[PDB]
Amino acid sequence: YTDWKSSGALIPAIYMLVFLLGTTGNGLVLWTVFRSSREKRRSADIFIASLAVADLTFVVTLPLWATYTYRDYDWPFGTFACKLSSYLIFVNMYASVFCLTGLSFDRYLAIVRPVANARLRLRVSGAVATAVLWVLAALLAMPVMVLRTTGDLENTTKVQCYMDYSMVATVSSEWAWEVGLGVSSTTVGFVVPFTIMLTCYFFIAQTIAGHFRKERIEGLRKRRRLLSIIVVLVVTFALCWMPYHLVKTLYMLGSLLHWPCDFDLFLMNIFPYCTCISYVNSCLNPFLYAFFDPRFRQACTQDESCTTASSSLAK
Amino acid sequence: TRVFKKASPNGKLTVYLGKRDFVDHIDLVEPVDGVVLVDPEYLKERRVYVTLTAAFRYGREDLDVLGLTFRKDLFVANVQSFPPAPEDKKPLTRLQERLIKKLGEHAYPFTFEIPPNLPSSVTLQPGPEDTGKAIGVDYEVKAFVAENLEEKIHKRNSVRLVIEKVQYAPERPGPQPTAETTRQFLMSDKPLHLEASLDKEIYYHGEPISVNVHVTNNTNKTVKKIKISVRQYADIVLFNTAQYKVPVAMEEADDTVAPSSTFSKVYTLTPFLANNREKRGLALDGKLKHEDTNLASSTLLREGANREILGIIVSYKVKVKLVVSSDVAVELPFTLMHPKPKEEPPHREVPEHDIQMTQSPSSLSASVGDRVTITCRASQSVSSAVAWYQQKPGKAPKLLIYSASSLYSGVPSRFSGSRSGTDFTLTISSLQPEDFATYYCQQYKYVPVTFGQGTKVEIKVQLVESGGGLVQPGGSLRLSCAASGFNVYSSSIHWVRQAPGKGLEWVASISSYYGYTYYADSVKGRFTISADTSKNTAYLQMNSLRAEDTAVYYCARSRQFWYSGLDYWGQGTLVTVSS
Ligand SMILES: COc1cccc(OC)c1-n1c(NS(=O)(=O)[C@@H](C)[C@@H](O)c2ncc(C)cn2)nnc1-c1cccc(C)n1
Numbered sequence: 001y002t003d004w005k006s007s008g009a010l011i012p013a014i015y016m017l018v019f020l021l022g023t024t025g026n027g028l029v030l031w032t033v034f035r036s037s038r039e040k041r042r043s044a045d046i047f048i049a050s051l052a053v054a055d056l057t058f059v060v061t062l063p064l065w066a067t068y069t070y071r072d073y074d075w076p077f078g079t080f081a082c083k084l085s086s087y088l089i090f091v092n093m094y095a096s097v098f099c100l101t102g103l104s105f106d107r108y109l110a111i112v113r114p115v116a117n118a119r120l121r122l123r124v125s126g127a128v129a130t131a132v133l134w135v136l137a138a139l140l141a142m143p144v145m146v147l148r149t150t151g152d153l154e155n156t157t158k159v160q161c162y163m164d165y166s167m168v169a170t171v172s173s174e175w176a177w178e179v180g181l182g183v184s185s186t187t188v189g190f191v192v193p194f195t196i197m198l199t200c201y202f203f204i205a206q207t208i209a210g211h212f213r214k215e216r217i218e219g220l221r222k223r224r225r226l227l228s229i230i231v232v233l234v235v236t237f238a239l240c241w242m243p244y245h246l247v248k249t250l251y252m253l254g255s256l257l258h259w260p261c262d263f264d265l266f267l268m269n270i271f272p273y274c275t276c277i278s279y280v281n282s283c284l285n286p287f288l289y290a291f292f293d294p295r296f297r298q299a300c301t302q303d304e305s306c307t308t309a310s311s312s313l314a315k
Numbered sequence: 316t317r318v319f320k321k322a323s324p325n326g327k328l329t330v331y332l333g334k335r336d337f338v339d340h341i342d343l344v345e346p347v348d349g350v351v352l353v354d355p356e357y358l359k360e361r362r363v364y365v366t367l368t369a370a371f372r373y374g375r376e377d378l379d380v381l382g383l384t385f386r387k388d389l390f391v392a393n394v395q396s397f398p399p400a401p402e403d404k405k406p407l408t409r410l411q412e413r414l415i416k417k418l419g420e421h422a423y424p425f426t427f428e429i430p431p432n433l434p435s436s437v438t439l440q441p442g443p444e445d446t447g448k449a450i451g452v453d454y455e456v457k458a459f460v461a462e463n464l465e466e467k468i469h470k471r472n473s474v475r476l477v478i479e480k481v482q483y484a485p486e487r488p489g490p491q492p493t494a495e496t497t498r499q500f501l502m503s504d505k506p507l508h509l510e511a512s513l514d515k516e517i518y519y520h521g522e523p524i525s526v527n528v529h530v531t532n533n534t535n536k537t538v539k540k541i542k543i544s545v546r547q548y549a550d551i552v553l554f555n556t557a558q559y560k561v562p563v564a565m566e567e568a569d570d571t572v573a574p575s576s577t578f579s580k581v582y583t584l585t586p587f588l589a590n591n592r593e594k595r596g597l598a599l600d601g602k603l604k605h606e607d608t609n610l611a612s613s614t615l616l617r618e619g620a621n622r623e624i625l626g627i628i629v630s631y632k633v634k635v636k637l638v639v640s641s642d643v644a645v646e647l648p649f650t651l652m653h654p655k656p657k658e659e660p661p662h663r664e665v666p667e668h669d670i671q672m673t674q675s676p677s678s679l680s681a682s683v684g685d686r687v688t689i690t691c692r693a694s695q696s697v698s699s700a701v702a703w704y705q706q707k708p709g710k711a712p713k714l715l716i717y718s719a720s721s722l723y724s725g726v727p728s729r730f731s732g733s734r735s736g737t738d739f740t741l742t743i744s745s746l747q748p749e750d751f752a753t754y755y756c757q758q759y760k761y762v763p764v765t766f767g768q769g770t771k772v773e774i775k776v777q778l779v780e781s782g783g784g785l786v787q788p789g790g791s792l793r794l795s796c797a798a799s800g801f802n803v804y805s806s807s808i809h810w811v812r813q814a815p816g817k818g819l820e821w822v823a824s825i826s827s828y829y830g831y832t833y834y835a836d837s838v839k840g841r842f843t844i845s846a847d848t849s850k851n852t853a854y855l856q857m858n859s860l861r862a863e864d865t866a867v868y869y870c871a872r873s874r875q876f877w878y879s880g881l882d883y884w885g886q887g888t889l890v891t892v893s894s
């Protein structure tokens with residue numbers, strides 16, 4: 001049940017690398033959005049902005065956790081600081097997934113139902129969607145706030161930050177409360193946004209393949225490139241997020257399956273690495289979403305059609 | 316007559332097309348016929364290909380995912396004008412033959428035939444802020460030079476002319492749209508029997524839609540209100556068929572029907588664009604450019620033949636609703652279309668948003684029966700968009716000529732209009748005694764609508780105006796023009812003054828359908844023109860009046876749809892603004 005010998009020597013290091021990359025990417029995209037907002041005036045951009053915010057506020061709280069893992073999981077910061085940090089991480093995880101799903105649905109509505117795209121008031125529809133997204137994210141994170149506390153010195157004088165279950169869960173309600181909260185967190189954080197995104201991108205892929213199937217050579221290459229981009233987006237989301245929720249679900253399954261002696265040790269060893277790879281999207285997001293937008297690239301850096309005249313046709 | 320020409324960026328190809336508006340009779344569509352002027356020097360051994368493309372831009376903008384373009388070519392047809400393929404064996408139309416005659420030998424004909432069942436040129440409303448391009452069906456004629464059908468088309472030797480394919484109202488009126496709903500409730504004694512009815516099936520644009528709503532509430536439950544709407548149904552049938560319904564004009568009448576009581580009322584609704592300018596997705600008539608157009612005309616189809624025709628199909632139904640204390644609704648279809656116009660539609664706003672018109676000779680006298688010619692030179696090209704009026708002394712002008720050539724129904728055939736570039740001429744062949752009058756020439760292409768100094772030719776349904784008076788050196792006066800027989804939505808009310816011993820000067824003009832009011836520079840802020848439909852009455856509120864405004868103000872009417880002139884006038888009111 002102990003941690004990997006080489007774990008603590010590295011988890012802070014990978015966290016630090018994630019800090020650097022997540023800053024230089026998310027802050028960059030947010031700064032670009034603020035700098036270039038009226039220049040683009042694109043409705044979907046709001047989600048990008050929101051995503052950036054979440055990602056930034058996802059990684060801003062990283063160092064406290066790095067130092068936490070530094071001293072055998074000891075928390076040299078405030079208890080309110082622990083609550084705020086954990087609640088921020090969860091709020092931002094859910095906000096990131098919801099913003100990615102919202103962008104996927106926006107693209108579905110602007111690619112697979114484009115006749116209705118102009119009918120809807122995207123400017124205010126997106127704002128309302130982001131408002132509900134963020135309010136709901138904060139609501140789902142309210143528990144992972146209230147059940148957050150500090151202590152667990154275990155007569156070892158190590159003041160650590162965690163999610164206390166005793167304050168609500170009774171002696172026999174610990175397992176039930178834990179499994180229920182874990183189920184709700186994982187489902188609302190991965191499943192529904194994930195399925196929505198997958199259906200949206202499948203419809204986008206089918207429509208784009210059908211649309212570019214005309215013409216030859218150039219059209220087919222462009223279609224393959226677009227399908228490759230849709231791939232890389234779905235694949236990067238899956239790779240980055242699946243390990244985290246998978247280990248959560250594995251914990252809840254093993255609560256009764258009772259992985260005897262080694263699989264559980266593997267779960268605890270890998271989970272910090274799971275968080276590291278979960279930050280993969282928060283890191284790469286500018287490359288796939290901002291950089292993929294030509295406006296971001298521009299910010300970083302005999303065709304006259306004449307005129308329809310008129311002549312005299314004498315009889 | 317006159318024809319349209321668009322040259323290429325290089326200057327070698329020039330596409331000549333007679334008209335931009337091709338009628339789609341339900342069975343056969345008018346062919347697109349034209350002439351391409353080709354310079355052989357540039358064409359060493361190349362070919363001239365002209366293509367008719369019926370596109371449907373179903374998605375705003377493009378490259379949303381860096382490569383996706385939403386533009387489906389509903390129908391593309393290619394014909395090679397140069398070198399003429401001997402397999403053509405086509406008979407040149409009159410316009411094509413005349414164009415080939417006017418041009419040299421190097422003019423080459425090209426004629427496409429549009430298939431019968433195709434969507435008509437319509438564009439859904441962009442909305443307040445979309446820029447880019449509009450979602451809708453468009454038609455394009457593109458003439459380019461290439462050595463093969465698949466060679467990369469160069470934007471330097473290609474000309475693109477946007478054409479519109481349209482339908483006009485059928486001559487024979489259809490059956491009277493009357494539909495009735497008999498609805499019962501928990502009190503099954505006797506039901507409501509709403510029996511709404513319109514007046515006719517064909518309602519030309521901007522004209523009223525009478526709705527006789529006969530109700531007999533034999534059941535206890537009352538009806539608090541009657542809500543009549545005119546809903547435009549846009550069926551978009553690309554990939555996924557859809558039916559969008561955008562309300563256009565409504566009336567939330569508060570009339571009530573007591574239990575076991577009857578009630579009859581004729582409600583009147585008029586669909587216009589002024590109050591629907593914010594309704595995104597609304598179907599409007601095909602636009603050549605970003606210019607104002609009317610609500611989309613109803614699309615006519617052959618019975619049992621709508622094979623999910625790709626494009627946008629526009630219909631209209633009037634939905635009457637009784638709000639019982641369970642709405643009781645009846646829908647009445649009706650076709651809302653332009654009548655067939657003798658002259659082609661102007662796909663630009665006719666008094667487009669100051670062209671001096673020097674008219675000569677100011678004074679000229681001649682005997683009875685001889686031929687008299689009157690010239691008028693415009694400072695800038697008016698594009699055959701002048702008209703000629705006749706004002707007898709102490710009377711109102713009467714529209715004689717419109718479009719610089721066309722005679723007005725009811726005018727002697729002696730009068731004839733002609734054009735010589737920017738010099739528009741009016742000829743009277745036999746000067747009968749009924750010709751002594753002042754003849755005025757008006758350019759109605761550019762607002763301010765500019766009249767001429769007037770030529771005093773010597774022989775040697777209604778509008779009523781009120782509100783004159785020799786009063787208010789600097790006060791206010793509201794001139795009222797009551798229009799009998801005319802709807803302010805199918806017509807535009809123009810207040811044009813005439814100072815004593817002076818020519819007509821255009822003061823104000825209100826067009827309700829598009830809902831814009833224009834004023835002259837001298838009355839830009841002082842005056843306010845507003846026409847209310849409660850009595851089909853226009854009003855001109857005249858504030859800060861000066862001595863220069865002493866004039867016989869006239870209230871004239873111009874066809875709001877394909878402006879032809881100030882055909883109908885009023886007696887006029889003398890506003891003697893003096894001490
Ligand atoms: C490794 O994880 C943490 C480390 C340090 C601080 C933490 O918190 C802020 C988190 N952490 C927590 N802690 S925990 O809840 O105690 C979690 C440890 C417990 O449940 C659990 N043990 C084992 C398994 C297999 C599954 N589950 N839960 N999520 C996050 C989190 C963190 C970052 C990013 C994201 C998306 N999530």
Ligand SMILES: CC(C)CCC[C@@H](C)[C@H]1CC[C@H]2[C@@H]3CC=C4C[C@@H](O)CC[C@]4(C)[C@H]3CC[C@]12C
Nearest residue numbers: 098101102105106109122125126129133192193
């Ligand atoms: C074109 C633009 C304006 C479309 C705006 C509406 C979009 C963004 C809406 C439509 C459906 C919405 C999703 C529906 C369901 C869920 C699950 C919920 O627990 C969190 C929000 C989330 C993930 C929503 C996010 C926003 C969403 C994708």
